[PDB]
Amino acid sequence: VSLPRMVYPQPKVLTPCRKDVLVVTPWLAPIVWEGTFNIDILNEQFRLQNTTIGLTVFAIKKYVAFLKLFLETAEKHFMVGHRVHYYVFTDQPAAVPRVTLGTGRQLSVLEVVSMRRMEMISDFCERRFLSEVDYLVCVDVDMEFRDHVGVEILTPLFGTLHPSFYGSSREAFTYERRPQSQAYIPKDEGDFYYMGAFFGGSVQEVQRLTRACHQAMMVDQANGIEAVWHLESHLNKYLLRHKPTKVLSPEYLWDQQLLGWPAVLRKLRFTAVP
C-alpha cells in the first residue's frame, strides 16, 4: 500500500547528520545509528505490512532471575505499536515471572549448549516460527532495554557490532584463528566483530543461519575442537560469508559499567545488567 501524506524535515543531501561514523557497509547495508532514521516513516512501512516480531531468549538455571526486568523493559521499549511474540525457552516454566503485556503482544513458554539452542530454532520450532512471526530476534536474557529498539532493525539478516571491538582493527578481533575449526577466519579477513548476544532477520534467514551454524558446530565436535567464543565465533564466520542486510551499532548492545557512555553513542538502547 501507499504511505499516507507525512510532514517531516527534508533530508539534506549535502548536510548529513552523522559524519562521525560509518552509516553504510561496503555491501550497501545500513549501519543503524541514532540520526540515520526517521522512525515515523519506518513505523508506517512496517505497520502497513502488519509485521509480527518474535523475540527469542533462553533462560536456564539461574538465568530465569533476569526474565522479569528483561520482559518489563521490552514492554517499554521493544517494537511498541507492533505485534510481538516472546518465546522464552527455559528448564523452569514455573519460574517465568508473570509480566503484564501491552495489547497485541504475547508470550509463550517453551520447556527444554549453544548447539542445543540452534536445534530449537532450525529443527524443533521451525514450522511454528514460520507460521507465527515475520522476523526473529535472538538476544540474551541477562540484559535490559533502556531506550527504543524498533523496526529500524528489521531486515532479512542482521548482526550487531560488539561493543568492545567497533573501533578495533580486524587483527584484534577475537575470531577463531585455528584452521582446524569451521569458524576459522584468517588475519587478513573480516568486516566487523559481531556480538553473539543480538542477531536476527526474517524467519527464513535466521533458520538458514542456525542450520548452518549447527552443522559447523557438529563438524567441529566430530573433529575435537570447540570454537574460542562458541556460537559467537560461528556467527562471525557466517556473517563474513553471508553479508548482513543491516548492521546494528553498539547502541544496541552496550555495557555502561564496562565501557561508559562515549560521545559516539547518542542512545544506550539495550544493555548488560549492573
The interaxial angle of helices 203-222 and 231-241, nearest 10 deg, is 120
Q: What DSSP state is assigned to residue 11? A: P
What is the amino acid identity at position 194?
Y
Is 126 a catalytic site residue?
no
For residues 180 and 159, give the distance between their C-alpha atoms in angstroms, rounded to a whole number.
25
Asked if residues 53 and 132 have their Cβ atoms less than 8 Å apart, the reply is no
Q: Which has the closest alpha carbon to 267: 159, 188, 165, 149?
A: 149
What is the amino acid identity at position 16?
P
Binding-site residue positions: 58-60, 63, 140-142, 162, 174, 232, 255
What is the amino acid identity at position 199?
F
Q: Is residue 239 exposed (0-12), middle (13-18) or buried (19+ Cβ within 10 Å)?
A: buried
Binding-site residue positions for UDP-N-acetyl-alpha-D-galactosamine: 58-60, 63, 140-142
Asked if residues 92 and 63 have their Cβ atoms less than 8 Å apart, the reply is no
For residues 151 and 23, give the distance between their C-alpha atoms in angstroms, rounded to a whole number.
17
Of residues 75, 144, 176, 232, which has the active-site annotation? 232
For residues 191 and 22, give the distance between their C-alpha atoms in angstroms, rounded to a whole number.
12
- Which residues make Cβ contacts (< 8 Å) with residue 263, sequence separation at least 6? 20
Total residues found in the chain within this entry:
274
Asked if residues 185 and 222 have their Cβ atoms less than 8 Å apart, the reply is no
| Residues identified as active-site | 232
